[PDB]
Amino acid sequence: IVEPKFRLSLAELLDESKVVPISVYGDLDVEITGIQHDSRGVSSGDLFVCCENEGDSVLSEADKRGAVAVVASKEIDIEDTLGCRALVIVEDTEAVLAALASSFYRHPSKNMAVIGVTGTNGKTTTTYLIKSLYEAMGVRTGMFSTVSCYVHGDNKMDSPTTTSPDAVLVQSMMAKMLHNGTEALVMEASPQELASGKCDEVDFDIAVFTNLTREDSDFRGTDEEYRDAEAKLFARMVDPERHRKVVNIDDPNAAFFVQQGNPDVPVVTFAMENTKADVHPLKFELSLFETQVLVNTPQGILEISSGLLGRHNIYNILAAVAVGIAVGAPLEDIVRGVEEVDAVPGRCELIDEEQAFGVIVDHANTPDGLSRLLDSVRELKPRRIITVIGCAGENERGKRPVMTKIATEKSDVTMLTSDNPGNEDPLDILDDMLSGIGWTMQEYLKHGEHDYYPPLSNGHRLFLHDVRRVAVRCAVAMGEEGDMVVVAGKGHESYQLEGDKKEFYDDREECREALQYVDELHQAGIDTSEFPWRLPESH
Amino acid sequence: PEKDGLFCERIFGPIKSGICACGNYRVIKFCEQCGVEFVDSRIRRYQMGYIKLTCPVTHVWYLKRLPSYIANLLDKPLKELEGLVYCDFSFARPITKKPTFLRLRGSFEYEIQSWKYSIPLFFTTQGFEIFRNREISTGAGAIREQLADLDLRIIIENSLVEWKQLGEEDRKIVRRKDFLVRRMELAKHFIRTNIEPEWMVLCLLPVLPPELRPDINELYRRVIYRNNTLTDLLVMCQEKLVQEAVDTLLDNGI
Amino acid sequence: EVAYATFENMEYGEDFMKPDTETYNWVIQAYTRADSYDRVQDVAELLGMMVEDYKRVQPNVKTHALLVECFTKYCVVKEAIRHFRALKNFEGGTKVLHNAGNFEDPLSLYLRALCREGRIVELIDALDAM
Amino acid sequence: PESFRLLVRELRSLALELNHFLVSEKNFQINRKEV
Numbered sequence: 001i002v003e004p005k006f007r008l009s010l011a012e013l014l015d016e017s018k019v020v021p022i023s024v025y026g027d028l029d030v031e032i033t034g035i036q037h038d039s040r041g042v043s044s045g046d047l048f049v050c051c052e053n054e055g056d057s058v059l060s061e062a063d064k065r066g067a068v069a070v071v072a073s074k075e076i077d078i079e080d081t082l083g084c085r086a087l088v089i090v091e092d093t094e095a096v097l098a099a100l101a102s103s104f105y106r107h108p109s110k111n112m113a114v115i116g117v118t119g120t121n122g123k124t125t126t127t128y129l130i131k132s133l134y135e136a137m138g139v140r141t142g143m144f145s146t147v148s149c150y151v152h153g154d155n156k157m158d159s160p161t162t163t164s165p166d167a168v169l170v171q172s173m174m175a176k177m178l179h180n181g182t183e184a185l186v187m188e189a190s191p192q193e194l195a196s197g198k199c200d201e202v203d204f205d206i207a208v209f210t211n212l213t214r215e216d217s218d219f220r221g222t223d224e225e226y227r228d229a230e231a232k233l234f235a236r237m238v239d240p241e242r243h244r245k246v247v248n249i250d251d252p253n254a255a256f257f258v259q260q261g262n263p264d265v266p267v268v269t270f271a272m273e274n275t276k277a278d279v280h281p282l283k284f285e286l287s288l289f290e291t292q293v294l295v296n297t298p299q300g301i302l303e304i305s306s307g308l309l310g311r312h313n314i315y316n317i318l319a320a321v322a323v324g325i326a327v328g329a330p331l332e333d334i335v336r337g338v339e340e341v342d343a344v345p346g347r348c349e350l351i352d353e354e355q356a357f358g359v360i361v362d363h364a365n366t367p368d369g370l371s372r373l374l375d376s377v378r379e380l381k382p383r384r385i386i387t388v389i390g391c392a393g394e395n396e397r398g399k400r401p402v403m404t405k406i407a408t409e410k411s412d413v414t415m416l417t418s419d420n421p422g423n424e425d426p427l428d429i430l431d432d433m434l435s436g437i438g439w440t441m442q443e444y445l446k447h448g449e450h451d452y453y454p455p456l457s458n459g460h461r462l463f464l465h466d467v468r469r470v471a472v473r474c475a476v477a478m479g480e481e482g483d484m485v486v487v488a489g490k491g492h493e494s495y496q497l498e499g500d501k502k503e504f505y506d507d508r509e510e511c512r513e514a515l516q517y518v519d520e521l522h523q524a525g526i527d528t529s530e531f532p533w534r535l536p537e538s539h
Numbered sequence: 540p541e542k543d544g545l546f547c548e549r550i551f552g553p554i555k556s557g558i559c560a561c562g563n564y565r566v567i568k569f570c571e572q573c574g575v576e577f578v579d580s581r582i583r584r585y586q587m588g589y590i591k592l593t594c595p596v597t598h599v600w601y602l603k604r605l606p607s608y609i610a611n612l613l614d615k616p617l618k619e620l621e622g623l624v625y626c627d628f629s630f631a632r633p634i635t636k637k638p639t640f641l642r643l644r645g646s647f648e649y650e651i652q653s654w655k656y657s658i659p660l661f662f663t664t665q666g667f668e669i670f671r672n673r674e675i676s677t678g679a680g681a682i683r684e685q686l687a688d689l690d691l692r693i694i695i696e697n698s699l700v701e702w703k704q705l706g707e708e709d710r711k712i713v714r715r716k717d718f719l720v721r722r723m724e725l726a727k728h729f730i731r732t733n734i735e736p737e738w739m740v741l742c743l744l745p746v747l748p749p750e751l752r753p754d755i756n757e758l759y760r761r762v763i764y765r766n767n768t769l770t771d772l773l774v775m776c777q778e779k780l781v782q783e784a785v786d787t788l789l790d791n792g793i
Numbered sequence: 794e795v796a797y798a799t800f801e802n803m804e805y806g807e808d809f810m811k812p813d814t815e816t817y818n819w820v821i822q823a824y825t826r827a828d829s830y831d832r833v834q835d836v837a838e839l840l841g842m843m844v845e846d847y848k849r850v851q852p853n854v855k856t857h858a859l860l861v862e863c864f865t866k867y868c869v870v871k872e873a874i875r876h877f878r879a880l881k882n883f884e885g886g887t888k889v890l891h892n893a894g895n896f897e898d899p900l901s902l903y904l905r906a907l908c909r910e911g912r913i914v915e916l917i918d919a920l921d922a923m
Numbered sequence: 924p925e926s927f928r929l930l931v932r933e934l935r936s937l938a939l940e941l942n943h944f945l946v947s948e949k950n951f952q953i954n955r956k957e958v
Binding site: 445466 | 637638639640641642644653662670
């Protein structure tokens, strides 16, 4: 991947961005080769933007790393503490930050087709499906997702491990795709990013609305503010000739979004249950390994066989179909693009190694995320559900008993383990989890001495192990014909934080490697139906 | 005196009062070139050293001198406990305060077949080593895990109820009763003192000051030699050689 | 051992130095609140020495409260019950045993030990005294 | 005394410590003698 080079003077950058400074000090002709807001990422020749929440030590760090000009909301004594050649004072640094990044990178979003997907659920899988849909038509398509970032095809970018990319970063990578030949792009438009104004300078072409449910406890706002934040993307649907709208009409809110923006913009409706939608399924079949759906579209009917699981993924397929319908895509490109996508990482990702039970890895780490995930697995009609779940340490202490009660009431077998202990002892977190069903670590360990763990009041089984690698692989070894093993918590994350070091750990690899070697364990006489294992030489 | 040896002047002090290893003299704190403390040479009569054992070894006083203290505290016959130290045995489920998932228990004279190939391969070797010494262990280290994990208050209650049951009910009942009284007496003393029962297994070996060993030196050499050999390999046969040598140094003729 | 050396000075001294009831209470209290080692045998031998001195020495409220506290701590419950019965007849009684909640609250330990051993009839009689 | 100081070191070789404490009869403070 080729790194673009940008060179703009400070005077030109302000003039292009239309930012009116309160006061300017130093030299306005200083050449700027980069823009940064985090001091640890500032390089020599970069323009530093100081947010209101970063103190005086941050400014020195940016200056030490070679910042040549600084933008901040408050007056700073340049003459004795800063070696920077210029300083810009603005009323609001956060609002100006988006404008500065877009002007510096020359508004790359104006040279591509930008498709923004907003909603509480389905943003990542729909973004993965739509990118494949555009690629099936031969368009070099990039992607901005919570999981991954691509320039086009399989060319993965080394994305920083930040759940919400900043406004500078979004503009920075977006121009990189342009320099490398990207023609279209699909980005997730999360409510937090839309509310924060990070995506304010993105020229969206098509806005897709999936659904809205109050799930994100991280959102610092009311339900109306959460709803209006997503409406920002639909508010920009102004040009009828260029812009398109795709809405899920099963949501009661959907009417609110359709009224947003220019009412003359074309709208394509998709629904699983409402047959009044333009794009809707006629019949579908769900199994542990695949879904098959017959979808009625304004241009005809389509047959789709997808590796994605659950009925919530049918909506994501329909949204990709409707977006293909909206752009007038060839029906055959719609089917090929959808069927090409097999596993978006960490989103109910099926781990297939030609075995008789399904293994899915998901990022669900909340009581309501786990409840929704286990209800989607149950509708696939497995014989048993085996869930591997843990809780993060030093934070979110209130969900520990809650997630155990949910797992034990919806899963036939539950295996508690460690998700991210940090500096907390893993057996202390597991004691907090055990309290949600009336158990304690001491009682569980007593049952281990008698080599027998009794079931719960509902007849389900609970097992425990503080080593995640052991607990994940032991749960795969408990799988039988027609079961489902759900490894929740981490999803696509590739680190297990113990103490302070972020040891490399991938849940997908552990499930993949356990499936390979489960055969030799069973022919060696080991009975792994439950805890404890029965070796041939044990009685 | 050889550097870092049994007579080293880093560890035990100068052999000449006020004279360092390099020969620099001062009137009676550490030399910059060698590190000798400029003190009286009499400190070699009182300065201790120690040997860092790669593998823990049981103290021969508390294992072999009948009646055995470790065997009485663990309620295991010295025969089944001596093979864990000097024979090719292995003890399953040494600990009870951490999760386990195998139905093994007790002393295994042979080796578990599946534990050799299938289990290490299924969990990978790097991931297997983390929880390996929690399902089945071997050597004196296994004994130390049992001692460290003992619930001394459970021992007293279990011994008392078993003692009373035998009373309700000829050379074995009386002998078993004396065993139970000794065990509960032993547990009580640990509770009310600051002595930990796991200290009966040595992790470090204190070394006598050189002036008191101007036999013992050769015994120290053997312990260091085998202990240095064992850390180069990192086996069970070498652990026995280290453990046996420490037994010879501490108490021969046992 | 510091207090016991002084007690031996008195017990085997002249007549004007002989222990009184307060002297026995101090030495008993020293052993009951010892930091380490088992002291229940020392207390029980001191009690036997005090009983052998009955023609000259008689107990008071503190003697029984200390003895209830000692036997409860070492879980010699049947002996703590005998001395609690004598403690009931003394005015103040259980308040002295409570020690204002200090020294691990000997009043509560006596009640807990009665509950743990199913001596409920004794436990109710203890509550009446309180 | 050299007879007793040498004894302490030989006992230390067997992982035993032999400490000599003086308890003051005046203020009951415990002093560990340099042995």
